[PDB]
Design a protein around this nucleic acid. Structure first.
Ligand SMILES: [Mg+2]
Ligand SMILES: [Mg+2]
Ligand SMILES: [Mg+2]
Ligand SMILES: [Mg+2]
Ligand SMILES: [Mg+2]
Ligand SMILES: [Mg+2]
Ligand SMILES: [Mg+2]
Ligand SMILES: [Mg+2]
Ligand SMILES: [Mg+2]
Ligand SMILES: [Mg+2]
Ligand SMILES: [Mg+2]
Ligand SMILES: [Mg+2]
Ligand SMILES: [Mg+2]
Ligand SMILES: [Mg+2]
Ligand SMILES: [Mg+2]
Ligand SMILES: [Mg+2]
Ligand SMILES: [Mg+2]
Ligand SMILES: [Mg+2]
Ligand SMILES: [Mg+2]
Lengths: 159, 175, 75, 168, 187
RNA sequence: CGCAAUGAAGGUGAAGGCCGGCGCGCUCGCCGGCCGAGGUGGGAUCCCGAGGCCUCUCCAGUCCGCCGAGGGCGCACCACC
RNA sequence: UAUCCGGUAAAGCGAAUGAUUAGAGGUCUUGGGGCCGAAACGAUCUCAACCUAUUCUCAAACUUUAAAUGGGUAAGAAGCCCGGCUCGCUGGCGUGAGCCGGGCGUGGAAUGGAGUGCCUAGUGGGCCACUUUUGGUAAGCAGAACUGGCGCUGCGGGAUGAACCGAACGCCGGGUUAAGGCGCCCGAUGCCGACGCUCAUCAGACCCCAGAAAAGGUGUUGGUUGAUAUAGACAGCAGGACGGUGGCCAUGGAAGUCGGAAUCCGCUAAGGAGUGUGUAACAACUCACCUGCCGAAUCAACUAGCCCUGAAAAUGGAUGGCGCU
RNA sequence: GAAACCUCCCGUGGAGCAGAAGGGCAAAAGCUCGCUUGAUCUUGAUUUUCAGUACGAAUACAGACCGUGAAAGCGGGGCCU
RNA sequence: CGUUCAUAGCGACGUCGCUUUUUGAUCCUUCGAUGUCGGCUCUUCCUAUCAUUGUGAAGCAGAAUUCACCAAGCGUUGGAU
RNA sequence: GUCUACGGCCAUACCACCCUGAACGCGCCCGAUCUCGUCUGAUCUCGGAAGCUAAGCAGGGUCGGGCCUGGUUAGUACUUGGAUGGGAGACCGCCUGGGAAUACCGGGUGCUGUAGGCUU
């Protein structure tokens, strides 16, 4: 039976990468989280105040509270049969903005551009995405030179 | 791979074009298989080994059956192999005598099963080349190279053993 | 008479009989556990919204009249 | 060379039973509506769809149906989903009643929507109740192994039409 | 063999009322018919409620019926209640109402009729309005029963406010180890 | 038993708003009038309803529906303040 | 489709940590032992550790790298975009939050009716298989992971059988299948089935499975690589096998011959400073190069198929049986 | 003198940080000084074990009263487990 | 090693097996009981052959012999503790 | 072209040695009355401005080390899913999709924000 200790098994998780030890460079601290920012948690060894628990590393969630130098952040943690949305108080250093949402906002902005225009025109445009369709009919010109023959090569033992 | 009687297929394909490589080179093969479906698969297997190129990364351009151009000639075919033993992997040069390449490769696949308990999926056919009377290294072939060939069909054992299941006459096997 | 000591064998199955339901998201979640000094001040702000009502109502009527003038100019 | 278009649409037959089947497979098989053995569905192809077929490969036989296949399946075994009651398409009054809000007003329209994979495919294809086909007459080759390697499972592209005729 | 779970195939809703009383059952015969033959969903809702339990059709107090009709616009209408109409002693002035109910208590009956109110039975409502047109369909507070105060996240489970089943309240019935901080802990 | 709680106890015990005036409107204290169980989101259901849709003719034209875009009062219940 | 998380497989050790082989190079250091030195970083070796490039081989409790499978989020009306009010928070002005009031609709694929509350029994001995996996020589042993079974469950196949494969059962007719089969037992090959392989005085004969290995075999069949030979070979028989030379080390005797460093020339047609026999040691014998005869292929070394040796148990016996070439 | 003290050079930490090991740490989290008692008083929220009960341990705040620093700040015990 | 000579007989360092007449592992069966050691008595099987029949080997001259093959037909005793 | 002050990302920015630096800067530099601090005006603090780019600093250089980025290694190693595939086992081959890491060989060797100079 294994030890219940808080930091058990974070030998690798909380360990600054190769040649990225030392001073926590300052952008990290000086970037602003509001309420409802989508934020991915990633514990860090240098800063031990406000560390998240090893279960929430990797996990993404939303900011609910913002204190002086930390951010309350609702994240969903599964427990055997039940997913528990729960609220944890991570110090900034263990947290980035999750880009996952921004590619969405880019698309909605692009849609609002393509909805305003193409209204006065009349031609309705494809706003929905569509999965990669089968690759269409097309010609391939074997331009002058014929195809290159590939015989499989005879075995030989190298070692 | 399994079998039945194979057909030569021509299969040419290319790693599909990109920004960086706009008009990529075509690669052609001789892929013996029971049908185009497994032909194309077999094409991809051989190319994967040789070239950094997968079914996802490429497109088969032209798969097409290839017909023996001299069906009603009797030929001698040299065939080079690459089988897998229980032990290590090997090379051979088999020789068959047949009316077709397909027939000659089919013939090979049966022989290899017989003589080496080698199953389809172990065998790689590299080259199949029709060959003269000479340049035939195997005496099992060479004995049929002769103008006035002459042999009997000596102990001609009967079939139709159950047309008359029972009969008065003891049979005959001299003809 | 030693036992089996621990397992997780039939458990995933057991969990998924009744789903593994995601935690039921509402709009308007509580302000439980929000930095006290904030909550005081948003409470006070909420207290005095009724102060500055008469100004606000007039501003919307002026807006509504400007909308009605704009729609009349369009038509 | 003329490399023709990769196919839009494929018929997908469930070719093994409903015992001892992994949960990820099982879910996809009930996202293709392939619950019983020897049920089949049309399926429009694309990166998403094709990969879902990749996750259920040794549980299905599938490929690119003929024109005739789409007719024979629709006429001989064409059943509507009409107030959630599997009902046989005996008249166009049934098809129309349900799909007529799309311009699909008859069996023929339906066949054209399925075969060309139109705008309104999702709605015509879902309208069709999944095709309960019989066992394969003349038998199969091998249930458990892939087509390529002698068996019946997996993509057999053109050759799905032979299988269709011996089952429909 | 087919894969479906047969687990939640049978829906558990009521079909008829569980009561055997004959007057209610006549109302059911009437509202089944109307439900099916009218387009009115009022009839359907009413029909549904005739099958429900006592618990499930709670009493609607006179004051609650007042204030719900005091609301702006539903004026010159009829309030309907598949439950009973009770009095409120803590309301005085009772406007002249129109009412449907399976029951109205004798006080509540007097007060309403004294006001110039009309009381209707459900057979009478149908003839008056078979498609439920110009009705206010109310309900009593379902979660009134003291029952519900024991339901929820259990007592002694942090942030629950759930009445425990206790023999008698008082200084020394619970309120020790697990409510005081002084005694063990608290939730 | 229920219709009142809460405190170990001495005990205390579920209303608020608005308006006008008087005290310095002091987001505090006192005097007159009006409303009277707050508000947000969702809510079965009711309510209003542009507008169709025809009538054996060209228009007029009350009656009856059917649908109804749009807009409202919003039970219960839930979440939030 | 975007976007984060990861330190397992692999890989690496001319990158850290630890392990570890070899020689090059280095009075690095210095030594301990030498030999030639009185002694001398003098000359010459040496072994110690250290170092300069290289080099061999490793890691559950090492790692610069770094997969596959995998875990989060996100993919819109609870969303966007305007206008204005509230704050005892924050502040050069501004933030940030909370309020009102308008303005805008399908925002990846596939599927499916959802939500929600109360009472609640039995259970809390488990076992089995794929794959992963710890202890152990191993176990029908013990212990985890993952899915699926059996337990709760019949049915076709596997002769027999919890668990293998196929498939999951209302009561019946017709059809068709699966996995398995089709000499007879026993439904179906009573095909003019196709091509090979293999004879066993222990033949062989189908997932789980109920049985064999190293190592052998001109048994037979295929390969692979090299030869050889008309300058007529290859075997099969017949003729010589010497001298410089008791060569040198070794004496205990080795003039070819217990052993070992050597190891070339002459005559040459050609014979090794010698394969053996044997001798105290010789001798004597025996083992190339070439012919004479005969008359086309010959021969070597690997390799992998079947077969065989290897292969011993107790009541009489089991490819299921009969049998089968 | 191989080791005392002084001085110059190189030194990515190969040292040290009470203790096991792992992580973390260089104008520090090490060493040496100066001043100190935030190891003080008081509400709730949260995390970790979890049944998502307790205990312990911790995280973010908030209100007091202080410490220290030119200050920004940091500090309500021991860099983190 | 056996004067000489790897293999008549042997056989190191290594290696591959069989066996269940040793002992361990293990705990599947039996705790509403399967009588727990030895000896006597009696039958039957196995061969991994001591003798006996037929044979190959030798470092078999004879005699004595060990090594191996077919082989379990027939035997394998009397006593002291 | 380039610098100084405060920077962001933190080696394409590090290290070694070599060369070149106009003007403005930045420095070294000259002093200890006062501020401040040392065993020591070396450092620290302070008041300067005679010299000089020697050094720091910048820019460049090196078949340089290092780092960064491509190729190769290699569809190799590994691997998701499959079979009544093989094999006495150990292990291996196929199908289905995913797919690395050295050695070796190329190329690159800071970009840039705000405020202020100089080259008028
Ligand atoms: Mg247990
Ligand atoms: Mg299977
Ligand atoms: Mg059931
Ligand atoms: Mg690990
Ligand atoms: Mg490894
Ligand atoms: Mg029990
Ligand atoms: Mg056990
Ligand atoms: Mg049981
Ligand atoms: Mg199965
Ligand atoms: Mg400390
Ligand atoms: Mg404080
Ligand atoms: Mg000897
Ligand atoms: Mg035992
Ligand atoms: Mg007995
Ligand atoms: Mg014997
Ligand atoms: Mg000075
Ligand atoms: Mg300089
Ligand atoms: Mg200079
Ligand atoms: Mg370089």
């Amino acid at each position: 039976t294994n030890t219940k200790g808080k930091r058990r098994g974070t030998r690798y998780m909380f360990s600054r990468p190769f040649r990225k030890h030392g001073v926590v460079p300052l952008a990290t601290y000086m970037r602003i989280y509001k309420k409802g920012d989508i934020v991915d948690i990633k514990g860090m060894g240098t800063v031990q105040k406000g560390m998240p628990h090893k279960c929430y590393h990797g996990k993404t969630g939303r900011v609910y509270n913002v204190t002086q130098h930390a951010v309350g952040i609702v994240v969903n943690k599964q427990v055997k049969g039940k997913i528990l949305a729960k609220r944890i108080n991570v110090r900034i250093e263990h947290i980035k903005h999750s880009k996952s949402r921004d590619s969405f906002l880019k698309r909605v902005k692009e849609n609002d551009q393509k909805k305003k225009e193409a209204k006065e025109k009349g031609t309705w445009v494809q706003l929905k995405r569509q999965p990669a369709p089968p690759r269409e009919a097309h010609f391939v010109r074997t331009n002058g030179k014929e195809p290159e023959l590939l015989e499989p090569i005879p075995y030989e033992f190298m070692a | 791979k399994a079998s039945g009687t194979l057909r030569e297929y021509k299969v040419v394909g290319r790693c599909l074009p990109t920004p960086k490589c706009r008009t990529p080179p075509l690669y052609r093969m001789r892929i013996f298989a029971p049908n185009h479906v497994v032909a194309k698969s077999r094409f991809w297997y051989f190319v994967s080994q040789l070239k950094k190129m997968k079914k996802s990364s490429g497109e088969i351009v032209y798969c097409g059956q290839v017909f023996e151009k001299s069906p009603l000639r009797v030929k001698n075919f040299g065939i080079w192999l690459r089988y897998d033993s229980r032990s290590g992997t090997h090379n051979m040069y088999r020789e068959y005598r047949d009316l077709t390449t397909a027939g000659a490769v089919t013939q090979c696949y049966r022989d290899m099963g017989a003589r080496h308990r080698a199953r389809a999926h172990s065998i790689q056919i590299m080259k199949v080349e029709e060959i003269a009377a000479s340049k035939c290294r195997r005496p099992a072939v060479k004995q049929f190279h002769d103008s006035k060939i002459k042999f009997p069909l000596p102990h001609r054992v009967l079939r139709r053993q159950h047309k008359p299941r029972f009969t008065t006459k003891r049979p005959n096997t001299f003809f | 008479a030693k036992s089996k000591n621990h397992t997780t064998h039939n458990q995933s199955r057991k969990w998924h009989r009744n789903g593994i339901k995601k935690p039921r998201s509402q709009r308007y979640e509580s302000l439980k556990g929000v930095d006290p000094k904030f909550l005081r001040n948003m409470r006070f702000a909420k207290k005095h919204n009724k102060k500055g009502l008469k100004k606000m109502q007039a501003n919307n009527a002026k807006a509504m009249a400007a909308r009605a003038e704009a729609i009349k100019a369009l038509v | 060379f003329y490399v023709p278009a990769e196919p839009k649409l494929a018929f997908v037959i469930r070719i093994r039973g409903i015992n001892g089947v992994s949960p990820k497979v099982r879910k996809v098989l009930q996202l293709l509506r392939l619950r019983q053995i020897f049920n089949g569905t049309f399926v429009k192809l694309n990166k998403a769809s094709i990969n879902m077929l990749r996750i259920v490969e040794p549980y299905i036989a599938w490929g690119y149906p003929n024109l005739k296949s789409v007719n024979e399946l629709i006429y001989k075994r064409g059943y509507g989903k009409i107030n959630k009651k599997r009902i046989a398409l005996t008249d166009n009054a049934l098809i129309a009643r349900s799909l007529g809000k799309y311009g699909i007003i008859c069996m023929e329209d339906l066949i054209h929507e399925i075969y060309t994979v139109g705008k309104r495919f999702k709605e015509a294809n879902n309208f069709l109740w999944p095709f309960k086909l019989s066992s394969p007459r003349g038998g199969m080759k091998k249930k458990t192994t892939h087509f390529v390697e002698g068996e019946d499972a997996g993509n057999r592209e053109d050759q799905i039409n032979r299988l269709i005729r011996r089952m429909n | 063999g087919v894969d479906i779970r047969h687990n939640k195939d049978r829906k558990v809703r009521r079909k008829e009322p569980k009561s055997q009383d004959i007057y209610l059952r006549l109302l059911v015969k009437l509202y089944r018919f109307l439900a099916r033959r009218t387009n009115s969903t009022f009839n359907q809702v009413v029909l549904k409620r005739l099958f429900m339990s006592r618990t499930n059709r709670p009493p609607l107090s006179l004051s609650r019926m007042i204030r719900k009709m005091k609301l702006p616009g539903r004026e010159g209408k009829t309030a309907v209640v598949v439950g009973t109409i009770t009095d409120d002693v803590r309301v005085q002035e009772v406007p002249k109402l129109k009412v449907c109910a399976l029951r109205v208590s004798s006080r509540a009956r007097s007060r309403i009729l004294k006001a110039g109110g009309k009381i209707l039975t459900f057979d009478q409502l149908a003839l008056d309005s078979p498609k439920g047109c110009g009705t206010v369909l109310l309900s009593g507070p379902r979660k009134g029963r003291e029952v519900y105060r024991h339901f929820g996240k259990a007592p002694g489970t942090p942030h629950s406010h759930t009445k425990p089943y206790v023999r008698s309240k008082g200084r020394k019935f619970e309120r020790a180890r697990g409510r005081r901080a002084s005694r063990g802990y608290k939730n």
